[PDB]
């Protein structure tokens, strides 16, 4: 009977903490310098993706809680498109930031060529564009749907034609493969190769304090991979379970489903806290 | 060493000097400091129209 | 053996005659004139093109162009009024600890660990700045280059020898051999026939151009002297030492007049300059700021705090409009 | 706008552009300070690389551009011109192992080199040991004891034991162990691997806190 | 310094022609290039201006959009491409070095000039007179007037002065209304005011015979006076 | 992101 309290409290807390985390990341990075390093522009546009995810969280919460009044047909269309777009954006910035660190460590000769700020901003603009692919597709198939009292109207993503949930089967397999399977595989292989290379470094190997520095680096490696997996796993596996394989419909499953959504957004809310607050460019 | 007594003539040349009391030299410093105080853009800030900075 | 004892005896006689002819007790004299007050220099222009540490700058006599020397191998002539880069000069040796700018505005001189003061022709046909004369003949690093004339350059070096040169021929007109430690600074006189020099052996020696012999030698600092500069009257100068003191030496009195030190300052001086009136003495430290000094009160009266590294070079314009200090922050800034 | 023949501004921006290009191209390269003292084999190693005051030697190895600041010509005080050389990736350092008597104006190549190695600006001082004997150092340590320069030495007077003791003394010169890493290499012939050794040392330098704006070191 | 240029000749009206200018002897990468034309019976008047490395290009309003300029900077060659030439383009065309920074002397070196014949709001410069009669050794003054005052807030009065010898190229005499050029004798001088300009040549000699020209550089187009020709 | 995707409740 307290599931409105639980869902609303979780959603409100993750919303406020994510929004203030990204906003302080922005103000601190304008206080600091961003365009000198690839790293600062990467964390900046990643925090931008996280903030533009977190803005649409009340609109996500109202569909569960108030259920009855989509405030706008254009409004729900634009919040859906910006939500799916910025989720792809934050995930792809995580993947490219891991690849950035792997080029920095595993290939340090080529890194002076690759890791210049101009090539960084080029790759950043390119991945924002490839996310905008999802944005324009969601704009083409977006908006709220009105139906006569067989269900209360809601903000969703529409059918291409009378056939549906098979094109949406393609949508679900695409979002799964290109937001979990490819990014988790890339981030694990890149950080694991990064630690296997960084073990052999003589500034890390001996002299117990430098071994402790190796421990801290592999520690935040496991923290990054662990938080990403722990957040985006339950909602992706939950969505793939409710492919209507075998009586996947139940009324009590909705609270757990929206909690899984809350964890998926908790990733974006913690990416400022996980990255800016804990990385060693805290000397600012 | 012979270069030491070769250096004695140099310090002997330096020894011949017109010594002046510190008060008179300091008065020369003080009198030069007051004289160019008008043409000093830093002692008094120049009006901003005349200032090229 | 006894002649060395007699030489030390005459040194003792010289310093005793320095002490005996002086009874001014200058702390009594100094308080008479009024203070100059808190002089708030503000960073009017910031000159952002050096990608590395910069060691020397020199002003023009038109008081609008300043040359700037940096460790990345660039000289920049720097229109100061509009912050325009006129004439970025690519050096052959990136290790340049000094820089000079001709009073005629036709030439710049710079050198360093390459042991060569190259002279560059600014105002020339064919357009670009050419190198005119590479002055070889020193063996140590060159710590200071200064133009007497378009054809007379005075250089001091880390082979303990100041040398005066003829740019046209390319050979030393005079060498000045009286320093035992590495020579770290120079200052040409306003009348441009005397020049004073500072060295690592904590001794500051006056020189002549035609005579070529040290007339006077000034001691009192306990470490290297990093920067030296004449009072604009020409009858005094001030030294900047790693001692963390600045001392005002008069030529004619032959004693240190005032010491510019405070208890809080610990790092070594790096560049020294005077105001046109000579009331205020610039001084640029390793404390990341150019604490600017009243020359007469021996009191600090302002701070040109704008730098994120040690300030290496300072220069006041000839009309007195500006003070431009550069640093390993890699940015020159004109205060005013 | 008050800009009339202020194509001075256009020229100034063009100079800014050329400066940024040259500065990026310069900071892409690797600066090494060859600080090996006199009568060592600094000449020998610079002939081993591909190759009047400061002598800057540049060379290429595995798509990495090097510059070597052989500053042995300067006889001035080292305090004055060494702060110029901060920000180098690594300090190559030669020590002649033999000296034929240190195997104190005579036995220079141990105690003077030990006195040289003091540190004020911190970086990975890639100290290379140079025998100056091909394999002859065996017979010259058979001929004369090494206890002459090192009174406290009582280990085996063979090749490897004496070399390891000299290495141990050179690392014991270092004070801050966790900051700097002294990459030590003893080789006189060096058909290869002295190029590989400086390559590996500067690679571990450019990995650590040079390519660790990201990756947090 | 040696600016040699080609491309002159007789062309049909409405035809197209590309002038070229081969700079040989200076840092042509670092110099602003202009073009100034002169009708055979008339004075000079500006054509175009490409900056150092094509950062900024202007044209003359009489031929705006119909002329095109282009510099081949590594080749050290300056072009002017002209299309559909009218009857007002019977003129001879000069390459003009200029370089701008504090203290610089623009419009100093002029090319030999090539002759081109076709078959068959802004400032204005006012001459003093058509001609002055000449005797060597006697001081004479040559004046121009402008529509607008030329003394900018810089203090820099953008008045230039020139001299085209009979059958030769022009040169620069007084740049920015006071400053003497290099390679010219020190007898010349310039005294100016707001729009009130005078060339105060003293000790007039031979080889100073020719026509003088005055120019403004405050804004574009660059306008030339008729000037005076010093001849008895 | 949460699957809107015409979710049935």
Author numbering:
A (entry chain R): 158 to 441
B (entry chain C): 9 to 61
C (entry chain B): 5 to 340
D (entry chain A): 5 to 55, 182 to 233, 241 to 354
E (entry chain E): 2 to 121, 124 to 235
F (entry chain F): 1 to 9
Authors' description from the paper:
The opioid receptor family is divided into four subtypes each paired with their cognate peptide ligand: the μ-opioid receptor (MOR) with β-endorphin, κ-opioid receptor (KOR) with dynorphin A and B, δ-opioid receptors (DOR) with enkephalin, and nociceptin opioid receptor (NOR) with nociceptin. These four opioid receptors all primarily couple to heterotrimeric Gi/Go proteins as well as mediating β-arrestin1/2 signaling pathway. KOR is widely distributed in the central and peripheral nervous systems. Activation of KOR by dynorphin and dynorphin-related peptides regulates many physiological actions, including addiction, emotion, and perception.
